Symmetry: C2
């Protein structure tokens, strides 16, 4: 089964600065036929459900701020927040839906420094 490992586990970034979170999959999640990477990114704040930010590794979800972007292919992916805002403090998770059982990374805590 595919295992996702995120890094770092926690990130402290100054307000307005760029935040970068990585996710590495044990197996490629790139579908060679359609060229799609079955990888998604979620944001989750205390007492609230997860919120989808990016899917297909780099397509932005409806309603999600433009400062959120995803990149990468195969086994290495990255979530980038162009300009960190106070409201971006939360836990971020990557998820693969390439093959069952689907799985999530351990999560990365993002805080203001």
């Amino acid at each position: 089964d595919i295992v996702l490992t995120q890094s770092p586990d926690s990130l402290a970034v100054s307000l307005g600065e760029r935040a970068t979170i990585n996710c590495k999959s044990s197996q490629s999640v790139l579908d060679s036929s359609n060229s799609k990477n079955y990888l998604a990114w979620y944001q989750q704040k205390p007492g609230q459900p997860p919120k989808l930010l990016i899917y297909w590794a780099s397509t932005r979800e409806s309603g999600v701020p433009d400062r959120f972007s995803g990149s990468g292919s195969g086994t290495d992916f990255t979530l980038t927040i162009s300009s960190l805002q106070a409201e971006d403090v939360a836990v971020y998770y990557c998820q693969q839906y390439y093959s069952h059982p689907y799985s999530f990374g351990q999560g990365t805590k993002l805080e203001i420094k």
Copy 2:
């Protein structure tokens, strides 16, 4: 935007008994062209990422105990946990992926009486 509302918000159940969690969608998530309900259920414990339990409303993910079962259709769904065990203490979420933006219910916290 399809909104999911779970009920109850929290519940306390006794070991060995049956727990029931409902999810209501503001609009139907049943695709009449293929007869599939684009609805999933997740389990999440403190400090851990979400874990997929059921998808397509009633298909149980591999590795998941058979005490977990999903039912329902259209706008009304139910997650049933039979023979409750201490390890089932967690927050449960329903998720719809019928139309964008995809969305999660507010979550239901399950505890042991």
